Design a protein around this ligand. Structure first.
Ligand SMILES: CSc1cc(CN2CCC(C)(C)CC2)ccc1C(=O)NC[C@]1(O)CCCN(c2cc(NCc3ccccc3)ncn2)C1
Ligand SMILES: [Mg+2]
Ligand SMILES: [Mg+2]
Ligand SMILES: [Mg+2]
Ligand SMILES: [Mg+2]
Lengths: 242, 199
């Protein structure tokens, strides 16, 4: 009983998960080849009209800075008023980092508000191998959820990933999410128009447009960006040859 | 009365008002996502609200019941204040549509203002071995006992292996009726003087 152990020793049960030959590396190789150059834009999203972000996106990764990450923050009031449906493609995916509190409920409201249904729930399970409190909390919270949503109505790329990410709990005040979420997303081969809202200089990445208030530089040009998906490139999965 | 008790019944039809109040409710419903499943309306209509005044509810959910169970939770009068994740491993501590599923979810709801519970002793991740397809991990009962020691608890849709001390277990594949608490026995005999639960 690892629960009983955690009560006795402070080692989270997930410290005891181990190992966390079909090589899905040509996928990652094909992704790398089709990736657009990284594009990024400093923008104060509370003051910025997201409709300027074109074309519509096949994938949106939404990482609002929640108050619970710190122990400008966005409340679920602010997040729910983002017009995400105005930039999402009719068939597209969202990945929303929800924290571990009321966000598990309000994030689902958001997804429905914006026209998606939740398809998966990706749990970021944080180990404390190197270092063995909400008022409403019944339990010590040791994980965060990233909700996957689909909207709208295969290929050669199948599912290879599990819905858990296991890493060590980062140092206090480190708000970065595990880069492994980018891998789960890119492994799907969802399309090439990928947007990361509330990204940072540290999260900029090939194949993605990053938009955030703390970016120090911008290179986004709406016409240049759209040219990466012009014919005959419009409908690629991101996982096929150039 | 400390030792295990159970009632073989259709939980749709049992009059649960006879059971008293419980510090903890746990339910592992047969969501309609087959054997003896309940429709969404039947789940909504279950008389959970009479089971507690102040306490916690543990609700296992998968697939679209992740949303449906949140609805039920709120309809029955609970706020979801935690969510337990059971990471599924084999005997060697390795993890067993768009993603392969390595975990199972249990919502934690609160009703009223529970007092004297040991909140924060356990964390919200369980790591435990899979057994039969239908077998929740027995670690949940220890977390619940440490959270609320000695108090009365009730399980909905349990199976014979789930009967535990301090717990009354309900389900339609239990063996008859086994009741030991004198207050429950009295109210049961009054409600069901010929020992049959219909309609
Ligand atoms: C429902 S528990 C369960 C949950 C799961 C899913 N989980 C497994 C553990 C988990 C951690 C993976 C998480 C997920 C799998 C199996 C059972 C199981 O084996 N359960 C015993 C059972 O007896 C069965 C018959 C219905 N059942 C009823 C049903 C009922 N009225 C409805 C009705 C009756 C007759 C006909 C039609 C409808 N009244 C009392 N009990 C309970
Ligand atoms: Mg230890
Ligand atoms: Mg799934
Ligand atoms: Mg990869
Ligand atoms: Mg067991």
């Amino acid at each position: 009983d690892y629960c009983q152990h955690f009560v006795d020793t402070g080692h989270r049960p997930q410290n005891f998960i181990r190992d966390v030959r079909e090589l899905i590396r040509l996928k990652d190789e094909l992704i790398a080849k089709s990736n657009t150059p990284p594009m990024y834009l400093q923008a104060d999203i509370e003051a910025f009209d997201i409709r300027e972000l074109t074309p519509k996106f096949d994938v949106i990764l939404l990482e609002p800075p929640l108050e619970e990450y710190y122990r400008k923050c966005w409340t679920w009031d602010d997040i729910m008023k983002l017009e995400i449906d105005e930039i999402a493609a009719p068939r597209s995916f969202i990945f929303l980092w929800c924290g571990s509190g009321e966000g598990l409920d309000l994030g689902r409201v958001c997804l429905r508000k914006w026209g998606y249904r939740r398809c998966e729930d990706i749990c970021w399970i944080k180990t404390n191998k190197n270092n063995p409190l909400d008022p409403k909390a019944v339990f010590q919270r040791t994980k965060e959820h990233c909700l996957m949503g689909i909207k709208g109505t295969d290929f050669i790329h199948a599912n290879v990933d599990i819905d858990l990410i296991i890493t060590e709990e980062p140092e206090i005040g480190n708000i970065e999410k595990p880069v492994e979420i980018f891998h789960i997303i890119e492994h799907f081969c969802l399309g090439r128009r990928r947007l990361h809202l509330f990204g940072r200089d540290s999260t900029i990445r090939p194949g993605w447009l990053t938009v955030g208030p703390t970016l120090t530089n911008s290179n986004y040009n709406a016409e240049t960006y759209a040219s990466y998906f012009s014919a005959p490139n419009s409908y690629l999965t991101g996982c096929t040859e150039e | 009365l400390f030792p295990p008790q159970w009632i073989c019944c259709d939980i749709r039809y049992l009059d649960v008002s006879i059971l008293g109040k419980f510090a903890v409710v746990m339910a592992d419903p047969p969501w309609d996502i087959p054997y003896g499943t309940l429709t969404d309306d039947e789940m909504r209509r279950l008389n959970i609200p009479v089971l507690q005044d102040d306490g916690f509810l543990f609700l296992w959910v998968t697939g679209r019941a992740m949303e449906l169970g949140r609805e039920c939770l709120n309809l029955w009068g609970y706020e979801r204040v935690d969510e337990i994740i059971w990471v599924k491993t084999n005997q060697l501590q390795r993890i067993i549509h768009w993603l392969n599923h390595g975990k199972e979810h249990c919502l934690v709801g609160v009703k009223g203002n529970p007092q004297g519970f040991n909140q924060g002793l356990d964390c919200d991740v369980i790591v435990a071995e899979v057994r039969s397809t239908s077998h929740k991990p027995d670690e949940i009962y220890g977390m619940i006992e440490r959270l609320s020691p000695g108090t009365r608890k009730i399980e909905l849709f349990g199976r014979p292996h789930n009967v535990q001390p301090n717990w009354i277990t309900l389900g339609n594949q239990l063996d008859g009726i086994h009741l030991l608490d004198p207050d429950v026995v009295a109210r049961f005999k009054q409600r069901y003087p010929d020992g049959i639960i219909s309609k």
